[PDB]
Symmetry: C2
Subunit: 388 residues, 2 copies
């Protein structure tokens, strides 16, 4: 007997006055979800957990009012795999997606992606395997526990000056990171130049710098920043214009030969397909940042990887946004290019298991069952408080 | 003094076992919203009302947790027009859109669009004008109260046969409609052919038939249906494939010269822009069905009309999905091609003021202040029950 006995949710705050070119995180929240089963492993009830990434807010209402109910109301026998000894993630996905009209991929994509995370967590636990190894198995590939991670921060903050910006970055380098990201477009172009040079000077030859415009720029502004930016050895220029203005992105290739990245705000394989079709991105050097937690989960992310193949892209071009363990498992299991990380933000959500250190921009996935949340005490404390 | 004193919401059920190619309306709901102002004329305070269209579900949670609060917390003086004698819809729009990241246009687009509807309703009432006339004024154009409307139905229903389908359609013709729409793709292609011929025979020369696939078809199926459909004198072929698969839509032009329609499931001007850029639709005969109530409202719809102009399209190509009075006002005020109508569904939401009859596919907008909800007793009853 294998069945989902309950789906609990609790909205947690991850707010602060940090600000980027488009938004400030003054009221930012996230949904912590628990998928409770009636299965037991390692002498404890198996409970899958999940939470959504920063930026799109918690989805308690949708989870309760539309998706959780469908799962709990579904015939338990129709959510199992071939052998009937575990849950089939895709069947659970399909079950919660009934009566949902096409298009409109936002908000509900976060609710579903967060539940999906907890479902895969439970499935892996029931199978007694680390999620990344279960994924490698299902895809017939060899997993690689060594995953590249970069530190994201450099936000605009009330009273935060250049010296403080430099300190923040040095703080990331002190922790083993060799690639850092900062926000831009939240100040006059010449002020951002100063912020960039300050950071560039601080990290010297020990790390590379990536900048994020958060989709705030129109074509002309995007080009203006491109001309200023291309004179520096940046790791990448992220989300220059509106995430859906593919023509704008395509036009940037003419002014910015260096690597660019985007995708965190595209939440479906259909939207990702359109990015690959009309975005004009360079598959040899650009980065795709789709976030499964905000995009209907891993079940959907697999369809997105299928889209990349149809368009001749390599999964190694993917570096998910979000800084969460779900992405780490996908990266390690399916060969993504790496994962984002927020060493000083949104804690305890995200991060790594207690003990794993970042060495030369890389961490090594320990063999913990499921996603590995249990290994991060301050996070797991929050989770077992929700359901155990 | 002009200020929004409260924003109330109540989720109403508009469910039934009707089914289309993609979804069934078993759990369908809608949010009824009231924007209460401190403006009282003759011991009667002005209250704006709004509700979202069928298909995307109610958004009580989002409205309460994210948007209403921003409006109520905003400085009342910063939401007024130049003269400070009325609310500025765009300022209210901007106020509720703060701290919202780009992309992900779904769900929140419905919440905002529903509040927006109530805001414009209140603004027009405060100005003492029918919304459509206020719109014509703001755009410097002449309003036209005669609006084209078509009856939408023909859903798959348990135990509903051809005879019953025929009766449904005759029922619409009896009420003055000369264009009817039915769902397709919810049965084998040859069964749908039978349903189509049945309806075609029933309406004879008194009306034209439109078919809706609800975005269920893949390219090959879309083409197969196109070959079958093009042999009949259909009014239009709606949403053939996924609303975001623009390439699929473009490819259909080769097999279906007759008019096609889509757009109900695109909820932003950015998404509409992409449809015009990559959809390959014929601006001389196709129809755009964007629904302001599901797309961030009229404030956003105006930006969408701007997008149509930038791409050489005429607003007369627009026939909003949803069957609601907000669209009727926009159609009459800005010259859209007409509006959808559900004579037998989702009542009392949608419809026309008590007394206005559909004659030869057209209704004539009476000069009621605001949207004109007060003129439809069964609907207004529900509204004043929410707030008065
Ligand atoms: Mg970013
Ligand atoms: Mg339709």
């Amino acid at each position: 007997s294998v069945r989902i006995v309950d789906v609990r949710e609790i909205t947690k705050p991850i707010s602060s006055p940090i600000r980027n070119a488009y938004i400030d995180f003054t009221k930012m929240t996230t949904s912590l979800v628990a998928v409770v089963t009636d299965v037991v492993r390692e002498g404890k009830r198996v409970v899958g957990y999940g939470f959504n990434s920063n930026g799109r807010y918690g989805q308690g209402g949708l989870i309760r009012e539309r998706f959780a109910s469908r799962i709990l109301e579904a015939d338990p026998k129709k959510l199992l795999n071939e052998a009937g000894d575990n849950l089939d993630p895709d069947k659970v996905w399909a079950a919660m997606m009934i009566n949902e009209k096409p298009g409109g991929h936002g908000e509900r994509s976060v609710a579903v992606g967060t539940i999906d995370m907890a479902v895969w967590d439970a499935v892996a636990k029931i199978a007694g395997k680390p999620l990344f190894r279960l994924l490698a198995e299902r895809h017939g590939v060899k997993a690689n526990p060594r995953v590249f991670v970069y530190a994201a921060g450099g936000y605009y903050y009330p009273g935060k000056g250049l010296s403080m910006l430099r300190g923040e970055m040095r703080g990331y380098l002190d922790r083993g990171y060799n690639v850092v990201k900062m926000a831009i477009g939240g100040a006059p172009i010449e002020e951002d130049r100063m912020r960039i040079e300050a950071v560039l000077e601080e990290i010297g030859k020990d790390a590379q710098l990536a900048v994020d415009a958060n989709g705030r720029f129109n074509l002309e502004t995007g080009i203006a920043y491109a001309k200023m930016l291309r004179d520096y050895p940046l790791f990448w220029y992220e989300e220059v214009g509106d995430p859906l203005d593919y023509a704008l992105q395509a036009a940037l290739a003419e002014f910015y030969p260096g690597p660019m990245a985007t995708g965190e705000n595209l939440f479906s394989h259909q939207d990702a397909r359109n990015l690959l079709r009309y975005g004009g991105m360079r598959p040899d050097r650009d980065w795709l940042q789709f976030d499964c937690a905000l995009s209907y989960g891993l079940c959907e992310y697999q369809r997105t990887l299928e889209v990349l193949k149809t368009h001749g892209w390599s999964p190694s071009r993917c570096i998910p946004h979000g800084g969460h363990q779900m992405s780490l498992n996908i990266a390690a299991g399916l060969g993504l290019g790496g994962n984002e990380s927020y060493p000083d933000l949104f804690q305890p959500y995200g991060g790594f298991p207690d003990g794993v250190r970042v060495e030369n921009g890389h961490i090594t996935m320990p063999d913990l069952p499921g996603i590995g949340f249990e290994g991060k005490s301050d996070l797991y404390k929050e989770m077992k408080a929700l359901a155990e």
